[PDB]
Design a protein around this ligand. Structure first.
Ligand code: A1BU9
Ligand code: MN
Ligand code: MN
Lengths: 670, 672
DNA sequence: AGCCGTAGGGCCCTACGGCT
DNA sequence: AGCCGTAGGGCCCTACGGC
């Protein structure tokens, strides 16, 4: 992968480390070939502070860096064999670039500290506002970043070896809690000291993953990638009524406008939203192969198509009625929603799982009928207890059904945001003839790979670690549903074998509830009541803002209609006024003065087509006006009375419950 | 392997379905009856065993997986009794590439597993059209249409006559191109049980004709293959003009794939990349931002990173496309329209060249200097009977983006007279001193289509292997500032001219361009000479300008007709308004206006659509002026259409303007 | 030879946290 | 252990004709 320089005198030679060949190509084209070598890596490198030594020494990118530098590692590290006197970290100007820099520095510090001490390690400073170096023309890269005469390299300086050791250990080591603490204490919502670099770069990454990747918002239940997909579907009018649209086109659009990351991240998030074994209320309606419970992936995105589900319309409902705040997209050329109106409680309905930095989230899905009944009960009683809420919300309700064992895990999770929930397959024992039996499994636990689970049983039977099983078959089909059959040896006890399978396979699995979501843009562990309270407050705001928007707009339109009504009442004078005017400007002025019109009204009259003078058109103007006056007084009633508003929220939730609410799938056994 | 086997183990009730890959295999696996139906995903095009030797065949992963899965062995050791399935079902995608994969599968079965065919174990599934591949189908649909024994319609493959079948496999799938070419020419039409010979002939012909007429060969008129046409049209439709900002490559590609070009991402993106590369295209058609590859064979950055738009000269390909100059057609699924051909206001086929490997034939057309080409067309426009030697007074020869040298005029002349000929390209190399009484060879230009890094590696190999004497060092000193610079140090006292001549003999420093000018002419492949290529280009331009003139005429007369209606309305506005006001509906008004004022329906409609702001004082004047200018314009257009020589002169003038704006110096030196 | 350029098709390494 | 899901990053097999 090394594209070496022609010179072999270390003192004038430089090596640039880039993320991959997309970046490597702009670099290779821009460089001075004589003195500047280029080593493309392959994205994120091994974190050597967490890895075993042998994994490190067998890692292909680690080996290539060692070979390139020529110095060996650790003990045998020989400075005078360095093939370059500048090693330049040139990752992309994005948060993942920052992460890759923290990773590279960790490796250098732990395995090549003398390289740092001798002042050989540098950080390049490519311009922001590019996704990667492959986005830059070679000449831009050269002039800004690589050319000795204009570039601003940062030389990496080690001051305090003690503070450095503690910094690498804290940020990059296996103990999460110290890293978590560092983030909470530091989170805000020429030479470079290596400790300062590691801390600022690592925090930059940590923060972005926490607030803008891996955790959902409490209000709409979405992570960024999901919000941008759904928003993208909305902007391209890909509603359930219209035909499916090619996935490649959806992804291309989302990536360009909103989500500056790899296609796999976008496509796979969309795919999960279309899987009825993953989403309790699927948000995407997929055409074609969208994967299976056996861990088959979707067909490639060139083959599939998609659109919104009907329930996703309720997530996006009234997004264009000034209900939620828009923000600039990543490059200032587009607007995107900060959050979706989310007219059902999607966070709890669909759940969320997310691996961040310093923390993670794991929120199970719920029955939408129960959830909405929960929100209605809270709406009538702000002081309701978790125990009273559990009269509506019994516990999780997984798309894959199955059993939950007991209530005490659910209770703890709802009270504290954390708890362990034991899940089991739906399995029965039945006769198969000749006095023989079988175990038949028709539902498996949430997030368990069915084919993996079966191979695990096949393995146990082969290693003779389970007695009694004479055959094992997946008889799943579209027509029959999930059906996994385990034949048992004649006169063996099938219940014992079943209990053994629960102990030794994912036929029984735990769900560790860890309910962290973004509240006011900050990560927080929340309980059931707080999730519902944040949801309800969001709904009040959305409906209130929609009411205010509809009021302003209706007033604007009535204002225009009053102008048109005046014009119809005095049409001969209107025509005369315009005919005697030389220009539009003069007409506009005369219309405003003669008939006491606003600029907006005069412009509307000037914009009126002659067809609007026919009988039916005159009547429509008046009908629309009288209808609007009514509408305006309805809107005003709502805004004058907080109880009327709250009731409106309840009636709208009730309508969604009646239309989309469905039966409980997962049985909570006592 | 990825064999997804069924549970039953009685051959006689078991079926195995062969599909193109995992995308298809996932729909198949979700839809199937897992008791009796195994699925084996392949990996796209399989080895053509009629062209490959045994070592290659038996080491091919997909071949091996099929041999293993069927259990019969192959060849002499074939045993029908060990078949693990009594139905082997070919279920490729319902497209031409699917048909190709079917012919490849049958060739394998026929040559290695003939008894399987003879025993009636081989079947062809018939999935429905309108899907890009099986992965586009829901599992229930795939089951009900294709796999369900209660409703499906398998074709059982029958071998009637083994001698005819032998001949068919050899002609269609074998190494002799000419008989395959003869087969296509004899059968092509341009613009249950299943006999295996009939299946092979029909499926292969489908594939071959589709590659010939709709993939691999350029149209003589605009010089474009379908993928490049769809990209450029796509850019135009989304208004990605040179004046607007760069658009992300990923969005262009997804857009083009969705609307026009139902093929892989990499086929589209790489075609776009090439059009943006100034070492590939003599006149680049795409303006790229970011890493778009190098002369060392580095690819472009992944499409997530790059951006693109049209170049200025591409606007000239698309000029007048919205003025009914070219026929639009339905796209592949009937939801869009696309151009059959671009107006192509410069002769793009010869300007940028073309290479393409089809079936039965290929094309290799070198690029040319646009100034020279246009002068050639002009000379032709004045003299239908102009000779090739005369044309060569304007068009000296190819002009490659990479410059360099062409040795002599013999190969050029043969290529322009016949459409075929070998042109010797040579690097630009000089001998120069390097100090200490030593010399070096310096190369600053290389032949078209030569990978610079690879040429350097070939030189290193000659040196390392003692196949060339006198080279002491070898470096690529190329840079953005320097341009291409490859240096070969020569040993003190060695003759550098002799070393250079040896390099020309033994390395890509000198390379042949084999001209083979095949293009689509009236939608069929034709070997054409220079004059024929220019003639068709000139005819296309006459048609474009005539049609544009006709279009403008129609639009002018329509506008004049509306303006006559507006004049009347403004001259009688009070009666107009009163007519409309007493009318209850649109229809009534339209009728009363028409009867009272001798208005057409279009006139009455335009009046009803008139805004009140059009009644201001200077409007009757603006309408009178426009009408007077229009009348003038109309008669100017009528002149053009009544006089062939006027039309042709208008063609000449537009070409000349393009030459003056875009024509550039020759790069490639032709040495005599 | 293997390369030129439109086509068919797919797989594997890395970080991150918490649960087993 | 190693899986879950958003993220960083990339490579190799095939057909086809001509030289
Ligand atoms: C790169 O280095 C390696 C390494 C070896 C590999 N081994 C196996 C498979 C692969 C990649 C194959 C995989 O197939 C699906 C493919 N994309 C599409 O179908 C597609 C279509 C259209 C678009 C699109 C994507 N993306 C957009 O932004 C919108 S337009 C994405 O990549 C390998 C790649
Ligand atoms: Mn990057
Ligand atoms: Mn296919």
């Amino acid at each position: 992968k090394l594209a070496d320089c022609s010179s072999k005198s270390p003192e004038e030679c430089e090596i640039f480390l880039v993320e991959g060949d997309s970046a490597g190509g702009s670099t290779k084209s821009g460089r001075d070939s004589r003195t500047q070598a280029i080593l493309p890596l392959r994205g994120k490198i091994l974190n050597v502070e967490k890895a075993r030594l042998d994994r490190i020494l067998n890692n292909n990118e680690i080996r290539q860096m060692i070979t390139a530098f020529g110095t060996g590692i650790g003990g045998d590290f020989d400075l005078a064999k360095a093939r370059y006197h500048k090693i330049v970290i040139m990752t992309d100007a994005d948060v993942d670039g920052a992460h890759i820099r923290t990773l590279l520095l960790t490796f250098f510090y732990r395995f090549m500290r003398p390289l740092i001490e001798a002042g050989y390690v540098y950080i390049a400073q490519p311009p922001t506002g590019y996704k990667g170096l492959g986005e830059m023309n070679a000449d831009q890269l050269w002039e800004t970043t690589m050319n000795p005469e204009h570039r601003a390299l940062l030389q990496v300086k080690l001051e305090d070896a003690i503070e450095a050791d503690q910094t690498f250990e804290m940020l990059m080591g296996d103990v999460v809690e110290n890293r978590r603490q560092f983030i909470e204490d530091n989170a805000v919502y020429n030479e470079r000291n290596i400790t300062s670099e590691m801390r600022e770069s690592f925090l930059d990454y940590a923060m972005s993953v926490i607030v803008a990747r891996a955790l959902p918002d409490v209000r709409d239940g979405l992570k960024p990638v999901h919000r941008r997909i759904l928003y993208g579907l909305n902007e391209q009018g890909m509603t359930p009524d219209k035909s499916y649209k090619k996935s490649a086109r959806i992804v291309g659009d989302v990536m360009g406008k909103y989500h500056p990351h790899g296609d796999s991240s976008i496509y796979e998030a969309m795919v999960r939203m279309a899987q009825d074994f993953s989403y309790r209320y699927p948000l995407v309606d997929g055409q074609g192969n969208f994967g299976s419970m056996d861990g088959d992936g979707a067909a490639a995105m060139r083959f599939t198509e998609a659109r919104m589900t009907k329930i996703t319309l309720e997530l996006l409902r009234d997004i264009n009625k000034d209900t939620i705040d828009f923000i600039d997209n990543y490059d200032g050329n587009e607007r995107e929603p900060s959050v979706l109106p989310a007219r059902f409680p999607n966070l709890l309905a669909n759940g969320a799982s997310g691996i961040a930095v310093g923390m993670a989230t794991n929120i199970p899905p719920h029955n939408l009928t129960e959830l909405i009944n929960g929100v209605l009960s809270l709406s009538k009683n702000p002081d309701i207890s978790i125990a009273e809420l559990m009269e509506d919300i019994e516990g999780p309700d997984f798309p894959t059904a199955g059993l939950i064992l007991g209530k005490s895990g659910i209770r703890r999770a709802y009270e504290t945001g954390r708890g362990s929930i034991q899940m089991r397959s739906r399995a029965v024992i039945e006769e198969r003839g000749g006095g023989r039996q079988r175990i038949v499994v028709t539902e498996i636990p949430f997030q368990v790979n069915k084919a993996r689970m079966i191979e695990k049983i096949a393995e146990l039977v082969r290693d003779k670690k389970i007695d009694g099983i004479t055959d094992l078959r997946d008889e799943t089909s579209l027509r029959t549903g999930v059906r996994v059959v385990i034949d048992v040896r004649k006169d063996a006890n099938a219940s014992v074998i079943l209990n053994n399978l629960y102990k030794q396979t994912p036929l029984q699995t735990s769900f560790g509830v860890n309910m962290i979501a973004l509240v006011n843009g900050r990560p927080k562990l929340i309980n059931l009541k707080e999730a519902l309270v944040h949801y309800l407050e969001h709904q009040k705001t959305v409906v209130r803002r929609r009411t205010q928007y509809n009021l302003r707009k209706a007033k604007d339109r009535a204002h225009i209609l009053e102008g048109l009504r005046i014009a119809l009442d005095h049409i001969d004078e209107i025509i005369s006024t315009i005919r005697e005017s030389d220009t539009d400007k003069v007409a506009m002025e005369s219309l405003q003065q003669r008939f006491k019109l606003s600029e907006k009204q005069a412009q509307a009259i000037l914009d009126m087509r002659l067809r609007r003078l026919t009988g039916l058109e005159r009547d429509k103007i008046e009908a629309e006006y009288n209808e609007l006056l009514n509408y305006i007084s309805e809107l005003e009633t709502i805004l004058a009375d907080e109880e009327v508003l709250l009731q409106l929220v309840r009636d709208e939730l009730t309508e969604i419950r009646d239309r989309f609410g469905d039966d409980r799938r997962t049985e909570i056994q006592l």
